[PDB]
Design a protein around this ligand. Structure first.
Ligand SMILES: [Cl-]
Length: 177
């Protein structure tokens, strides 16, 4: 509880990070032009699925110290890019939007923005303070960051994304860290 009943966080113009609440808030979603959802849990339902409005993708993971989240990065990344590729907004969430969801977004910012693991972590954190991936996930993000830098993973730096202004705010924010 406490500060945990936070508001849906906008990471990028087309990328939002939230909790199981925001996952249910059909009004905000349609308002924000959400067309895609990623549910990073195994037990929560794909809210509003029946309504046949958005496209979904579940990354069946728990916030355990044993969970493998890497296995899902690539997949989650495409789905995020698909939503991007076509003017739709994407909402990613888990339970509290505190550990699992965040790890995915941080990883994302890493792969598509040669941003450091710490910069990405700080960036997302800046916009959503409650953020706190678990040490298991932190290590995976560390490995991932190493993998990116050594090239064993195709870092996609295609301008296919962000417009100038977006990149500027991004850059300006990292300057604050
Ligand atoms: Cl969580």
């Amino acid at each position: 509880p406490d500060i945990e009943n936070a508001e849906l966080t906008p990471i990028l113009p087309f990328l939002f990070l939230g909790n199981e609440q925001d996952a249910q808030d059909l009004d905000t979603m349609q308002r924000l032009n959400i067309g895609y959802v990623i549910n990073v849990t195994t037990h929560l339902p794909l809210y509003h699925y029946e309504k046949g409005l958005f496209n979904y993708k579940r990354l069946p993971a728990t916030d355990s110290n044993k969970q493998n989240l890497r296995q899902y990065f690539e997949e989650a990344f495409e789905f995020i890019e698909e939503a991007h590729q076509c003017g739709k907004g994407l909402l990613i969430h888990c339970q509290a939007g505190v550990s699992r969801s965040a790890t995915i977004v941080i990883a994302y910012l890493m792969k598509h923005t040669r941003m450091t693991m710490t910069d990405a972590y700080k960036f997302v954190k800046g916009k959503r303070p409650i953020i706190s991936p678990n040490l298991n996930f932190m290590g995976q993000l560390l490995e991932f960051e190493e993998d990116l830098n050594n090239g064993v993973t195709p870092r996609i730096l295609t301008p296919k994304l962000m417009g100038v202004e977006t990149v500027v705010k991004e850059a300006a924010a990292l300057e604050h860290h």
